[PDB]
Amino acid sequence: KIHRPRRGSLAYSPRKRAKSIVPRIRSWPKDSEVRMLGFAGYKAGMTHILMIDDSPGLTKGKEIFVPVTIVEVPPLFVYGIRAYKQGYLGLETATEVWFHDLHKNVARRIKTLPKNYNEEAFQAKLGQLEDLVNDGEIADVRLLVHTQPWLIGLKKKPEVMEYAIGGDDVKAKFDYAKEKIGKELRAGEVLHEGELLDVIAVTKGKGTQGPVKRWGVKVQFHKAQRAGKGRHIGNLGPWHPARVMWTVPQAGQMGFHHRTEFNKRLIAIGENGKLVLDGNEIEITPKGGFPHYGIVRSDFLMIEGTIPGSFKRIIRVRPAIRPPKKKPPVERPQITYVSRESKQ
Amino acid sequence: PIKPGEEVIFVVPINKIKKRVPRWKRAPRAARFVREWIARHAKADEVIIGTDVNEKIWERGAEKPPGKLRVKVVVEESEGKRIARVSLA
Amino acid sequence: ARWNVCSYCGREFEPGTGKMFVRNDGRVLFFCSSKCEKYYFMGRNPRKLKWTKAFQEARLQR
RNA sequence: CCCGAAAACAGGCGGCCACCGAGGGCCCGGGAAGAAGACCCGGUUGAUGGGGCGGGGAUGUAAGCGGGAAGGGAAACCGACCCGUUCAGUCUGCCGCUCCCAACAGCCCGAGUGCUACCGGG
RNA sequence: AGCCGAGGGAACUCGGCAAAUUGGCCCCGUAACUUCGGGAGAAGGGGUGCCUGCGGGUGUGUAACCCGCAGGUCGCAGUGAC
RNA sequence: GGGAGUAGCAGCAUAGCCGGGUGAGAAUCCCGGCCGCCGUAGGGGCCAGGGUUCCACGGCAAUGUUCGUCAGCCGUGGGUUA
Ligand SMILES: [Zn+2]
């Protein structure tokens, strides 16, 4: 006989359209630094730089070529604190506290906002939460966040999410949260330059596709091409078992999947659309803008390589949950050149 | 909306329905596009297109209608229904 | 980070782009784009094309 | 890492309505999505599509006018091509500013009844 | 049912199936073998546009159809498509 | 009866649009213009064979692979001179 490995992976099945456009983070890393474990933004475009290699391995100490993805990140607004307790099987929500004066555009997502809810009641509810957290029935604390697209002119309907906090304790977490609620978070207060990140997003749509493109099936011989069966597979299976198995390549939806990617290095965090190299202040937006995305105004991240999704899509980053043992240092690498030329 | 008597210049983009249709059926589609565009933008309930506009569209055959037409639109009120008359410019 | 110079249309092009062509005799050529390279190996004359610099170098020799 | 409240113990939290009306769909302008359905952003608390003004890009220096041209013809004049006016002209399924035209006028689905056997207040 | 495909060039297949290559005209030059009639368009090579002109054949012909040469110039490409 | 309001009404010649009319009613009937196919035949003529299919007026139950105010369909009246 002849052997080869099967065509495609059974680890990303069922290959179906994502339940939502906003991604979902299922697991969170073990960090000791008490801080928010992630941030969110909108993707703008790609370009390239030249930098002196800091990462272990030959090519270290030389000038190389590095492609880069720019992620636009205006500040977030913290509007909630949420407690969790332990039930029979797993965690379960216990209490929520919201802030009172929320933007007029949050009701584009959450139509049913409360009516009286002044600062009196806000502070009373906070106090109740604290008297609960000092008891012992509490397992972890998380923050509720919403984005502000009105600043960059992208849209008005916002995105709402729930992020976790670092640390083994809950009262330190509550102090952090109680200090942060009602205000804005910027990315420099949370993310460091040089960290490894995991990026999380929803991929581009390709539509209904066949098995040649969707699983890697080999095109058939030219006689079958002239017979009407070239981009088809040959067999749906054997005679016994007398049913089709789920492992047989078929056609269907390709793209718009919820994906994750490990270990992408954050290189630079900028302020107001400009990158201040050691020497001088510079812009990142190229001549003529970015294709399919305009000009960058607020704040942005440089990410080494590629990430999942189309341009104006919502991305979510977290610190690496699966890092190696030989890490590159945490500091902005020496950058010698950044491309501002036309990308269209 | 646009006042009846006063005549307005509109630019109809036909580059939009190209590649929506086979090549040999682009001018017959461009005609209907002109009609609907002008109705929508004049708030008109009837439209009357000129032999001159038609012969402009078909100047080159059924495969290469102009990418942008430039027309003059003048409106009439009769029985409480708006009626556009379209000419060239 | 050196800006290199096209051997067909004479302009400076940025790091991370272009091509180097090596002849078996050791002589080298730099190309900014696919167009300049194809026109070179095809045989076109950059001295008649007003978007190059050979054009001005010839405008002198007129 | 991917799927996953139809997990029949068919979940937890916060908030809004019910005991006219909370919410939703059709409809309108579009695509970052798409075989039909679904999905996403916007709808005058407005830059969603078009236009006009500019930026960037692709080809490669428009027609007309003026001068030259191997050679020919008494002469007037012919004459492929070349130079200048000219990084020009044409185009833009790309970005930005600007209410000049159009996102109007509307129409429908919609929970709302109770008893003994009760749990904890009355 | 059709058009193009970098780098390699039949590694595909029972099998170079299918597709591609060549392709008109003028000049040069053309083997083995041969029933001396052929093979033979063997093979292999060069040329080919537009413009300005000069000559030749038949003819009474600044009517008509044909045959040779120089110079200038444009293009990736001159049997430019068929 | 279910199959099923499904297949087929693609492939060899991919052709319609603006304006006007008639009419109860018009993608498909008439007039004009634009755009197109054939073009040593899809043009022009005429055997055999068919037998009234020819012409005008009036019609739309059925036929016409859709509609139809159209028709080689239906009705009435005519028409072939050596
Ligand atoms: Zn060049």
Question: In this complex, is the C-beta atom of A342 within 8 Å of any C-beta atom belonging to chain C?
Answer: no
Task: Say how far apart CA B58 and CA C30 lie, in whole Å.
Answer: 49
Q: How far apart are CA C9 and CA C47, in angstroms?
A: 9
A198, two tokens: 């995991």
Distance, in Å, from the CA atom of B21 to the CA atom of B33, rounded to the nearest integer, reads 12
Q: How far is the CA of C49 from the C1' of E9 (A)?
A: 38
β-strand A335-338 against A314-319: which pairing, if any? Answer: unpaired
C-alpha–C-alpha distance, residues A97 and A129, integer Å: 8
What's the per-residue H, E or C state across A140-153?
Answer: EEEEEEECCHHHCC
Upstream peptide bond of A286 is cis (omega within 30 degrees of 0): no
How far is A317 from A343, CA to CA, in rounded Å?
25
Q: Identify which of A303, A49, A46, A53 has the alpha carbon closest to the alpha carbon of residue C14.
A: A49
CB contact under 8 A, A339 and C1: no
Non-local (6+) Cβ contacts of A226 within 8 A are none
Token pair for A114 = 């409360």
Spatial contact of A96 and A148, defined as CB atoms under 8 Å apart: no
Does residue A42 contact residue A151 with C-beta atoms inside 8 Å? no
State residue B34 phi and psi, 5-degree precision.
-55, -50
Q: Which amino acid is at C43?
A: G
C33 assigned binding-site residue: no
For chain B, list the contacting chains (3+ Cβ pairs, <8 Å).
none
Residues of C in contact with A336 (CB under 8 A): 1
Q: Is A112 exposed, middle or buried (0-12, 13-18, 19+ CB in 10 A)?
A: exposed
C12 touches chain A (CB under 8 A): no
Can you tell me the distance from the alpha carbon of A270 to that of A68, in angstroms, rounded to the nearest whole number? 14
Contact A63 C14 (CB under 8 A): no
Name the token pair of A39.
Answer: 């941030």
Q: Which helix (H) or strand (E) holds A249?
A: none
* A191, A315 Cβ separation under 8 angstroms: no
Among A84, A90, A114, CA closest to A102 = A114
> Of the candidates A183, A245, A250, A336, which has an alpha carbon nearest to the alpha carbon of residue A7?
A250
DSSP secondary-structure letter at A74?
Answer: P
C59 CB-near residues (< 8 Å, 6+ apart)? none
CA–CA separation, B36 and B44 (whole Å) = 10
Nearest-nucleotide field for C42 (CA, C1'): E76
Distance CA A162, CA A185 (A): 14
Task: Tally the C-alpha atoms within 13 A of residue A183's C-alpha that lie toward its C-beta.
Answer: 9
Q: Report the alpha-carbon distance of residue C1 to residue C15 in Å, rounded.
A: 6
Backbone angles phi, psi at A222, to 5 degrees: -65, -25
Place of tokens 């409106």: B75
Q: Using CA atoms, how far apart are residues A142 and A153, in angstroms rounded to an integer?
A: 29
The rounded distance, in Å, linking the Cα atoms of A164 and A31 is 11
Q: Name the closest nucleotide to B1, judged by C1' and CA.
A: D101
**What residue of C is the nearest CA neighbor of A51?**
C1
Known binding residue C29? Answer is: no
Structure letter (DSSP) for residue A94:
E
How many other β-carbons are positioned within 10 Å of the β-carbon of residue A242?
A: 7
> How far apart (Å, rounded) are the C-alpha atoms in residues A128 and A144?
18
What DSSP line would sit under A191-247, residue for residue? PPTT-EEEEEEEPPEEEEE-HHHHH-PPPPPHHHHTTT-SSS-S-S--SSS-S--TT
3-state class (DSSP) for residue B80: coil
Q: Would you call C16 an interface residue with chain A, using a CB distance cutoff of 8 Å?
A: yes
Concatenated DSSP letters for A110-125? -----SS--HHHHHHH
CA gyration radius, chain B: 13
Angle at C21 between CA C20 and CA C22, to 5 degrees: 120
Rounded Cα gap, residues A344 and A46, in angstroms: 11
Alpha-carbon distance A330 to A239, whole Å?
A: 59
Peptide bond just before B65 cis, omega within 30 deg: no
Question: Token pair for residue A44?
Answer: 């703008």
Q: Quote the minimal CA–CA distance from A290 to chain C in Å.
A: 18
Please give the C-alpha separations between residue C55 and each of A308, C7, C48, C51, C61, in angstroms, as whole numbers.
47, 13, 6, 8, 10
Please state the φ and ψ torsions of residue A280, each to the nearest 5 degrees: -135, 160
Residues 31-60 of C with CB under 8 A from A: none
CA B61 – ligand 1 centroid, Å: 39
Interface with chain C: mutation pick from A335, A341, A342, A343, highest number of C CBs within 10 Å: A341
Q: What is the CA radius of gyration of chain A?
A: 24
| Alpha carbons A343 and A293: distance in angstroms, whole number | 12
Nucleotides in chain E near protein beta carbons (<7 Å): 1, 12, 17, 75-77
Distance separating alpha carbons of residues A247 and A249, to the nearest angstrom: 6
CA of residue B8 relative to chain centroid, distance: 13
Residue A108 DSSP class: G
| Annotated binding residue C46 | no
Contact C16/A341, CB-based, under 8 Å? no
- A92 Cβ contact list (under 8 Å, min separation 6): A84, A85, A86
* Chain C hits for A63, Cβ within 8 Å: 1
Contact at CB, C1 and A65, closer than 8 angstroms: no
Query: Which residues lie near nucleic chain F, judged by CB under 7 A?
Result: B 22-24, 27-28, 31-32, 35, 47-51, 53-55, 57-62
Side-chain-side CA neighbours of C24 within 13 Å: the count stands at 0
State the residue for tokens 């067999």: A235
Resolution in A: 3.0
* Residues of C whose CB is below 8 A from A66: none
Other CB atoms within 10 A of residue A243 CB: 8
Termini Cα distance of chain B: 21
Rounded Cα distance between A64 and C17, Å, is: 13
- Which amino acid, residue A341? E
Q: In terms of Cα–Cα distance, which of C41, C47, C51 is closest to C19?
A: C41
Asked if residues A320 and A330 have their Cβ atoms less than 8 Å apart, the reply is no
Amino acid at B10: F
Determine the distance from the C-alpha atom of residue C60 to the mean position of all C-alpha atoms in its chain, rounded to a whole number: 19
Cβ of A46 under 8 Å from any chain C Cβ? no
Helical H segments across C13-53, by residue range: 34-42
Yes or no: say if B80 and B64 are a contact pair by the CB < 8 Å rule: no
**How many angstroms separate the first and last alpha carbons of chain C?**
37
Residue at A216: amino acid letter: G
Work out the burial of residue A28: count CB atoms within 10 Å of its CB; fewer than 13 is exposed, 13-18 middle, 19 or more buried.
middle
Structure tokens at B33: 């596009």
Question: Any known ligand binding at C59?
Answer: no
Phi-psi region of A252 (alpha: psi -120 to 50; beta: other; left: phi over 0): left
CA neighbor of A100 nearest in space, from A83, A79, A81: A79
Ligand 1 center from residue A156 Cα (angstroms): 45
Q: How far apart are CA A225 and CA A336, in angstroms?
A: 53
Residue pointed to by tokens 């009196």:
A120
Q: How far is CA B34 from CA B8, B30, B39, B50, B76, in A?
A: 15, 6, 8, 11, 18
- Name the strand (E) or helix (H) holding A49: strand A39-52
DSSP code per residue over B31-77:
HHHHHHHHHHHHT-SEEEE-HHHHHHHGGG-SS---SEEEEEEEEEE
DSSP label of A290: B
CB of A339 within 8 Å of any CB in chain C? yes
Cα–Cα distances (Å) from A324 to A231, A264, A267, A305, B76, in that order, read: 41, 12, 18, 18, 76
Kindly state the helix (H) or strand (E) to which residue A95 belongs, with its residue range.
strand A91-98
3-state SS class at A50: strand
Q: Which residue, A274, A311, A229, A265, is CA-closest to A44?
A: A311
List CB contacts (< 8 A) between C16 and chain A.
Answer: 48, 50, 65, 339
Verify A-C touch: 3 or more CB pairs within 8 A: yes
Give B45: exposed, middle or buried? Use CB within 10 Å, 0-12, 13-18, 19+.
exposed
